C-alpha cells in the first residue's frame, strides 16, 4: 500500500496526549442536558472567592481547631504593638493552606498576580480602634517597630459602620511568574510579610467586652494566573480505600 516509516514515540502511552480512541457503542445518544445553575468554566472564578485565612495557626490550638479562624484584639498598655505576622505566598505551608486559593495554587507550579486580604471586625458596636496593616517587599525579617513597618505598603484601618478593609498585595517581583517558595534554594521566590499593628488603641466603655476578634479573608484579583499543572502533596493515600 502506501509507503510509511515509523518514528520514535511508537507504542508509548503518554498520559496527557490528546488522541482519538475507538468507541464502544455505535448509535448511542446521551441524556439531554438541562439548566443546572452555578456552572464553572475556569478555575480562576473560584480563586476570586474570599475564604477564611488561618492566621492563628498555633501549636496550642490543634485540639480546639475552631480558634484558628480568629485573632484577638485587646486593650493595650504599651503603644504601637505587633499583633500578627504571616507570609504572603499562597503556595507555602502556613496560613494560606486553609484558603481555596491556596489549595488550588498547589495544583500548579508557578503563579503571578495581585492578592487582596479582607479583615473583618467581629466586636461590639461601642468599640473604637485603629490598626495599621503593612506589607513589606523581600529583604530582612519582620520589623521590631512600626516606624520600620510604616515604610512599606500600608493601610490605616479605622473601625466603624463599614466593618471591613481590603489590603491589596501588589505584584512586586523580579520575574514574570513565581514558583512556590520553600526552605532552601527556592526561596528567591519569596513575597514578603504582612504585619498588623496597633495604630492608636482599642477603646471600650464600661459594659463592653475588652477583647474582640478579627477574622481574615483572602482571595485573588483579576490579573491572577497559574501555570504548569502538577500533583498536590496535600492528599496522601497510605494503604487502601475500602
Amino acid at each position: 500500500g502506501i509507503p510509511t516509516e515509523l518514528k520514535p514515540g511508537t507504542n508509548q502511552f503518554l498520559t496527557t496526549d490528546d488522541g482519538v480512541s475507538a468507541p464502544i457503542l455505535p448509535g448511542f445518544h446521551p441524556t439531554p442536558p438541562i439548566h443546572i445553575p452555578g456552572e464553572v468554566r475556569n478555575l480562576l472564578e473560584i480563586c476570586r472567592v474570599e475564604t477564611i485565612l488561618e492566621v492563628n495557626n498555633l501549636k496550642t490550638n490543634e485540639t480546639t481547631p475552631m480558634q484558628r479562624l480568629c485573632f484577638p484584639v485587646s486593650v493595650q498598655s504599651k503603644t504601637g504593638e505587633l499583633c500578627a505576622a504571616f507570609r504572603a505566598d499562597p503556595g507555602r505551608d502556613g496560613p494560606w493552606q486553609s484558603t481555596i486559593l491556596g489549595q488550588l495554587c498547589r495544583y500548579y507550579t508557578q503563579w503571578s498576580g495581585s492578592l487582596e486580604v479582607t479583615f473583618m471586625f467581629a466586636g461590639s458596636f461601642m468599640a473604637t480602634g485603629k490598626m495599621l496593616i503593612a506589607y513589606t517587599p523581600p529583604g530582612g525579617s519582620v520589623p521590631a517597630d512600626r516606624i520600620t513597618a510604616m515604610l512599606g505598603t500600608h493601610v490605616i484601618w479605622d473601625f466603624g459602620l463599614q466593618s471591613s478593609v481590603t489590603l491589596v498585595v501588589p505584584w512586586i517581583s523580579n520575574t514574570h511568574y513565581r514558583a512556590h517558595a520553600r526552605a532552601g534554594y527556592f526561596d528567591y521566590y519569596t513575597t514578603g510579610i504582612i504585619t498588623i499593628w496597633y495604630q492608636t488603641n482599642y477603646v471600650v466603655p464600661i459594659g463592653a467586652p475588652t477583647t474582640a476578634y478579627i477574622v481574615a479573608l483572602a482571595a485573588a484579583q483579576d490579573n491572577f494566573t497559574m501555570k504548569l499543572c502538577k500533583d498536590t502533596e496535600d492528599i496522601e493515600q497510605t494503604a487502601n480505600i475500602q
Epitope: V75, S77, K78, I206, T210
Partner: antibody
C-alpha cells in the same frame, strides 16, 4: 542587667526643698516611663507621678500637684524629683520605679527624707 | 480613683501551710492587678502580673487567681524567706492605687 540607683538620705528644715535623683542604667532611658512611689511609716504605699524622658511630659497625682515637680536629663540618664514647701507630713521614703506593661517591674533602693528643725 | 480594699492587715500561719491573701476592688479592673512582696528594709519585688502570670525568678509556690472584683494570692507551701508584707496594685486607671498590705507572721 537593669538597675536604678538613687541619691542618699537628706535632712532639711521646714519650708525648704530637696531634689532626689534616680540614675537608670542598662536600659533605653528615653522610651519608658519612670514613676515615683512614697511610703509613709509604716502602713501605706502611694503613687506620686510618672515621667516620659523622651518628650518630657508629666502626669501627677491629684494630692501631690503643687508639692512635687519632675524633670529628666537624658544626657546623664537621671530623673529628678523636686519636693517643695516641705512640712512635717513630708517625712517618708521615696521610691523610683519603672513601668513595663502597666506594672512596676524594677524598683530603686529607697531614699529617705526627714524634715525637722 | 478606684479604691482597692485588702482585708485583713494581719494573718499568721506556720510553715508548710497555705496562705490566702484577698484583695477586693470597687470598679472593674480587667485583670490588671499585680502582687508585690516587700521585706522589711528593702524595695518591693513584683511576683504576679495580670493575676495569673509569674515573673521570671519567683518560684512555683506562688500562684494567683481571681474573677470578678475579688482576687487571691496563694503560697503553698510557706517557707521562712516568704514572711513579708504583701501588696496588691491596680494599674487599670490612674492613680495606681495600692492595697493596704497583709503582713505575715508565724503561728505558735
Amino acid at each position: 542587667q537593669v538597675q536604678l540607683q538613687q541619691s542618699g538620705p537628706e535632712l532639711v528644715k521646714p519650708g525648704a526643698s530637696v531634689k532626689i535623683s534616680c540614675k537608670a542604667s542598662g536600659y533605653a532611658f528615653s522610651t519608658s516611663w519612670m514613676n515615683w512611689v512614697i511610703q509613709r511609716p509604716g502602713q501605706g504605699l502611694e503613687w506620686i507621678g510618672r515621667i516620659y524622658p523622651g518628650d518630657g511630659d508629666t502626669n501627677y497625682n491629684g494630692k501631690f500637684k503643687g508639692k512635687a515637680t519632675l524633670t529628666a536629663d537624658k544626657s546623664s540618664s537621671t530623673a529628678y524629683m523636686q519636693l517643695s514647701s516641705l512640712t512635717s507630713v513630708d517625712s517618708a521614703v521615696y521610691f523610683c520605679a519603672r513601668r513595663d506593661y502597666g506594672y512596676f517591674d524594677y524598683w530603686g533602693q529607697g531614699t529617705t527624707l526627714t524634715v525637722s528643725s | 480613683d478606684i479604691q482597692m480594699t485588702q482585708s485583713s492587715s494581719y494573718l499568721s500561719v506556720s510553715l508548710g501551710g497555705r496562705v490566702t491573701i484577698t484583695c477586693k476592688a470597687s470598679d472593674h479592673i480587667n485583670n490588671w492587678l499585680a502582687w508585690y512582696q516587700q521585706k522589711p528594709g528593702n524595695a518591693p519585688r513584683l511576683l504576679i502580673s495580670g493575676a495569673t502570670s509569674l515573673e521570671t525568678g519567683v518560684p512555683s509556690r506562688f500562684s494567683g487567681s481571681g474573677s470578678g472584683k475579688d482576687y487571691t494570692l496563694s503560697i503553698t507551701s510557706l517557707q521562712t524567706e516568704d514572711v513579708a508584707t504583701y501588696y496588691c496594685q491596680q494599674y487599670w486607671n490612674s492613680p495606681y492605687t495600692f492595697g493596704g498590705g497583709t503582713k505575715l507572721e508565724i503561728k505558735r
